[PDB]
Design a protein around this nucleic acid. Structure first.
Ligand SMILES: [Mg+2]
Ligand SMILES: [Mg+2]
Lengths: 12, 248, 487, 485, 232
DNA sequence: GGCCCTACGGCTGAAAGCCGTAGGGCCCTACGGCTGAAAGCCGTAG
């Protein structure tokens, strides 16, 4: 819900 | 004044009316669920509080073409129980209850149902908001069952942890096993609870719905409730991020 | 493979099958525990699941499903409805379910759904199930052999007489009223003391100790003929009335306030039946009808009358044309040894007491069997304390566990059970405080076994055990008479 | 009486509803490929015992335990949820085993909850494998009284094997099913090639996942949509039924297969409503000659002044005899919604399997060290056995025995209690050497476990070995056949 | 021949055979059983008419109520014959009318309520033996499997918990292949055919059992109950 | 969304329904993306 990570780092 | 069904009616069937005849002292509780409406029929003050229960979700009146909406028995019931009329025919002089309380679960589906309810009021009956007739009733979340003394009710985990700490520190005693009842909706409450927590005027916790700007409400309603999916998607993506920080 | 079958034989077979199944296993109470199968199986499913008073309430759906899947192969509809009637304090004089949530009201007001309500046994229901795990009642396999179910419950108070039972069967229909607990206890105490009395001696005693029905709804019984007819013959007809008080308005007017009503009189249908006889103008003396009942004052129906009207006349007309006065038609049917029977009061007392004594005798036998087992183990343990060093030696010098077992049988004069006990014994128990606790537990169990053999040998003590356990129960759980009796 | 602005209320409430539906009702977690209701029905079943070694339990008991302990919504839409998982025209790899009337590929509804029986399937046991070994985070339930798993170990790529489908707020997801063996070939790649990048992996998986594989058979027509969906998360895959022309002097059209999710009764009704309209001439009569023994069979006699190819293609056009599966690979990753390519789905599942096996090995290690630290104090009690027996007997209480035990040797309170609780049975000759041998075996195992935690190569190995065990035992032949257009 | 639906009852799964001789109406205890029947039937010949619950008792009920009960209407329509004087055996749409009620005790009761309808309202259907009863098993003792048709026949068969005894409380617990093979496959099933030998002895029995004289029903029950097991 | 139809006995008081166990049902709505031009299909929720 913030637009971080995507592949690497998972989704954030 | 207005006549209330008794034996002769001329009003909705699900409606359980009030004895009083004066709208300035009468109140209509629109209540999610027939279980919860039934247990509010019992807990009320039959003098002044009427009850229209709703099967689950209401028709979305902003996606739904005006014709299907009037054929919908629940919307037609909410309209007939208010006496006013809809759109340009509306008349606040014919209003049947000068407090309209929306009581829905404290769950996300009660938020959706109270959202389908405030969409209807705003599009068919805007004046009822403008004059401060439409309220929201805040249900409780916990019963605290002290042993020797009266129970307490708590409406937020903050209040629950405060009341548990304060009572224990006062020497009151509580079971670990069955001691604090978490409610998950109004259907889980008996009539005495519903009265002591959302219907008795002297311990009620209501919220008056107001209208600052009827034009940005018009576009808000259009976005959230209407048929434009992209506008929704964009709205949720823009605002979900900051839901935990709106009151700091 | 068509198989011709005459219609007279099929109608006869299939309809008697339905009728016996409804008569002995659905609609009629068994005389010992007061329970139709549905009540027995719901409350056993709860007990076995844990939904006791100690634990917290568990959603009804869990009791309804546990019942339907292990004991009661019928629809979740009626099982929920049965459980609910058991939780209502206006339906059972001594409710056996503790419900949380909207379980209904005296009116047409319905109960909430199965998903919103929670439910567990009441403490009296636990008396119904006291020591059911001590082989006190017969158990049989359920409909599919996967588990076992009680045939009857210990029923340590007299449920059938306390909570009543009402059931439409085929060809007959029971309708036993409830009674006050302290009274029934007096009757049972008599029937235990005078265990030898002929039927009519007993009947007169119980009839005078059991002054009459005690409905959960309070109200009034008028006259004694019906009640006597019921207990002597098992059929009677008991006039009941509600309670009215008279009020005088600030301005000379008078009113009639109804606060209690007869048993199983729906409040809504009664207010409707007055309004539909002033509307059809045959019940005059009334001018309006306002229902001031709220959950905080209880029932409160207010009937305001004309100034050219007399209070007591309108009251008598309400008695005659509404149910402010109605007759409980007693018919005292119940299942005894799998057959229906209309029973007199002394029979309902003797048959229940005979059940209690079956229960205490079975319970005392069970405890005696299990106690003999425990002393046979502690005696093989004292035989090894005395000879402890030789034992420990034998075991530290035995190849297997089986060689040490055979060696301990050869070395004392003991079973394979006593040996096996010895090997299963922890070292934490070889301290001095513990070796003493062993000899002492033997002393205690041989005292207890003595007492139990005594019990099994003197029926005087058996009856005395029933008396004293039921007096404990009545003192924790007895309540005052609700229903007032007059002449 | 506090005021509230209609704008603020409408916003706070609709956002809370929409995010709750997006994250916790409509959309599948990417690892185990389940919505909450599914995870909670499978988990209450597991916990209740309704496994395939044991007799089917009355299907009311699973609904009751699901709604009681974990999922506080209606029995109706939990019965339906459970029922769908046992229809084999709905799950390519069904997770519930149904005895009774569970519906039909048409409009025959399922028997009420009180009639049916239900337990878990072997694959669904593989969704729960070693969930009792700290292989997944648990959190407290709706009332804190018990705990539930956030996710299941999912020892097979359930999300892709079984698809998902769901309407949320502001979006919606439609992942088709796939052949378990093909999915396992692709996972095997991502394991043997763990360092490889996204271009390469997308290449390799797209090459081992030839496309959807539906429980209903049928056909996929065209390679493009399959490839769109896998490369960008969205794509329109056209499916076809199978027609079998048969020539009393009468020529017929026998439908034996249909596209996934096509209602058999609504299909017949659409033919009969477009021959009532009269915009599909050429048909003599429509007759469902279908039964449990012959399977789907909708025989369609055609007129002797009509041709077979022409009418078949008219049906492809105006009906769902061919129709288009519109994928939108959308799932919840790390708590947020994400559309994903086929390389991001396979990789995300794989990382989950590795997580699960390094967690299970952590658990196994801790428990091995527990049991060894105990066994060590027992063998120290054996080498000095005469001293210890004499000490206890001479003690007065058990705490005094215990203190003396910690004096004599150098043991903890855990170890002294484990010697105290030690039963005489174990002081036999074969049993003391059993204690010794046991300490040795457990230290061996402890070594193996340390070694696995050091070497990711070994962790990928355990995933490949255990998933091939599974896929050999439970995988099956591809159903939907693939053609081009 | 007779037309089959593609005015007949709303709930009727009909057959796709036009020759009543070779056709069969299976009449069933509600929708959940109707389901398994419709799935496992042979749709060429067998039709399925589900009824909701216990049908109205005709012998206790004035005729005008009986004809407004929707399930009765479904039955009269589904057969077509009409009733009483207007009865027209010519118009009979099925030449086996099979009563398949749940194998349990309440299914025997539904069976009696229905044979009462058919005797007071289309008695020649029984005279010409177009009325049958089907024997859906109540129990599958799995062990060489075996089937049992009442709570008693179960214990004689277990004397003579892992998917062993399986109770079929309705046809809804039954998946179509088992309902096909136990009750409906014409090549192995056992149908039971209702016959009428003394009409007057039959007529008096129905009044006794199904009618309003509860004083005459009670005495019948208590005089013939202990002696039912011995009618063979 | 509990509210509907049956059986079953006994009261009333005269034709139904009430009462408590049993058999069996009825289908509104929101939500996103379709096909097709309105609409209802599908799967989790009230
Ligand atoms: Mg809720
Ligand atoms: Mg739409």
């Amino acid at each position: 819900w913030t637009x971080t990570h995507x592949x690497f780092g998972x989704s954030x | 004044e207005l006549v209330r069904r008794k034996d002769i009616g001329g009003l909705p069937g699900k409606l359980a009316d009030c004895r009083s005849t004066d709208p300035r002292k009468s109140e209509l509780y629109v209540v999610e669920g027939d279980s919860a409406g039934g247990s509010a029929k019992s807990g009320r003050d039959s003098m002044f509080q009427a009850i229209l229960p709703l099967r689950g979700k209401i028709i979305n009146v902003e996606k739904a073409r005006i014709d299907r909406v009037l054929k919908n028995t629940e919307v037609q019931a909410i309209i007939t129980a208010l006496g006013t009329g809809i759109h340009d025919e509306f008349d606040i002089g014919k209003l049947r209850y000068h407090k309209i309380v929306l009581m829905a679960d404290a769950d996300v589906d009660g938020q959706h149902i109270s959202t389908l309810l405030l969409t209807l009021l705003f599009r068919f009956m805007r004046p009822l908001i403008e004059n401060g007739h439409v309220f929201l009733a805040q249900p409780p979340l916990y019963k605290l069952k002290w042993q020797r003394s009266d129970p307490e009710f708590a409406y937020s985990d903050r209040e629950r942890d405060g009341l548990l700490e304060a009572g224990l520190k006062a020497g009151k005693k509580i079971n670990k096993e069955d001691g604090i009842q978490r409610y998950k909706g109004l259907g889980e409450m008996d009539a005495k609870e519903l009265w002591e927590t959302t219907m008795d005027p002297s311990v009620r916790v209501l919220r008056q719905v107001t209208l600052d700007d009827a034009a940005a409400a018009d576009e808000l309603f259009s976005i959230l409730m209407g048929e434009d999916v992209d506008a929704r998607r964009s709205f949720i993506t823009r605002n979900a991020k900051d839901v935990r920080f709106l009151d700091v | 493979r068509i198989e011709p079958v005459d219609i007279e034989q099929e109608m006869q077979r299939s309809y008697i099958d339905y009728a016996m199944s409804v008569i002995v296993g659905r609609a009629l109470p068994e005389v010992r525990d007061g329970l139709k199968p549905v009540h027995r199986r719901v409350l056993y499913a709860m007990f076995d699941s844990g939904f006791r008073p100690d634990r917290s309430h568990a959603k009804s759906a869990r009791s309804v499903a546990e019942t339907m899947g292990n004991y009661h192969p019928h629809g979740d509809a009626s099982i929920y409805d049965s459980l609910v009637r058991m939780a209502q304090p206006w339906s059972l004089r001594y409710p056996l379910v503790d419900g949380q949530g909207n379980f209904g009201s005296p009116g047409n007001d319905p109960p909430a759904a199965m998903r919103f309500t929670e439910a567990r046994l009441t403490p009296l229901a636990m008396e119904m199930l006291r020591e059911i795990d001590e082989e006190t009642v017969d158990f049989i396999p359920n409909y599919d052999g996967r588990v076992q179910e009680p045939t009857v419950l210990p029923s340590r108070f007299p449920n059938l007489l306390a909570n009543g039972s009402g059931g439409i069967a085929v060809g007959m229909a029971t309708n036993i009223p409830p009674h006050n607990l302290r009274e029934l206890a007096d009757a049972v105490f008599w029937a235990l003391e005078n265990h030898d009395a002929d039927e009519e001696e007993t009947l007169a005693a119980v009839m005078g100790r059991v002054k009459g029905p005690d409905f959960p709804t309070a109200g009034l019984i008028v006259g004694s003929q019906g009640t006597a007819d019921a207990y002597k013959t098992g059929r009677g007809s008991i006039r009941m009335r509600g309670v009215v008080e008279v009020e005088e308005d600030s301005r000379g007017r008078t009113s009639l306030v109804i606060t209690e009503l007869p048993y199983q009189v729906n409040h809504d249908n009664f207010i409707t039946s007055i309004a539909e006889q002033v509307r059809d103008g045959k019940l005059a003396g009334i001018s309006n009808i306002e229902d001031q009942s709220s959950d905080r004052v209880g029932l409160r129906i207010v009937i305001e009358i004309k100034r050219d009207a007399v209070a007591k006349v309108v009251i008598n007309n309400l008695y005659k044309h509404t149910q402010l006065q109605t007759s409980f038609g007693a018919n005292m049917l119940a299942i005894v040894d799998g057959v229906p029977r209309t029973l007199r009061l002394d029979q309902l007392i003797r048959y229940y007491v005979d059940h209690q004594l079956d229960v205490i005798v079975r319970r005392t036998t069970y405890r005696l069997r299990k106690a003999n087992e425990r002393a046979h183990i502690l005696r093989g343990l004292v035989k090894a304390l005395d000879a402890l060093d030789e034992v420990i030696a034998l075991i530290r010098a035995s190849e297997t566990v089986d060689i040490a077992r055979a060696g301990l049988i050869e070395l004392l004069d003991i079973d394979e059970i006593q040996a096996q006990a010895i090997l299963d014994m922890q070292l934490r128990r070889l301290a001095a405080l513990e070796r003493q606790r062993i000899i002492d537990d033997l002393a205690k169990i041989e005292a207890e076994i003595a007492d139990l053999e005594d019990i099994l040998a003197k029926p005087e003590r058996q009856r005395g055990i029933v008396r004293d356990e039921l007096a404990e129960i009545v003192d924790r759980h007895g309540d005052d008479r609700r229903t007032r009796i007059i002449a």
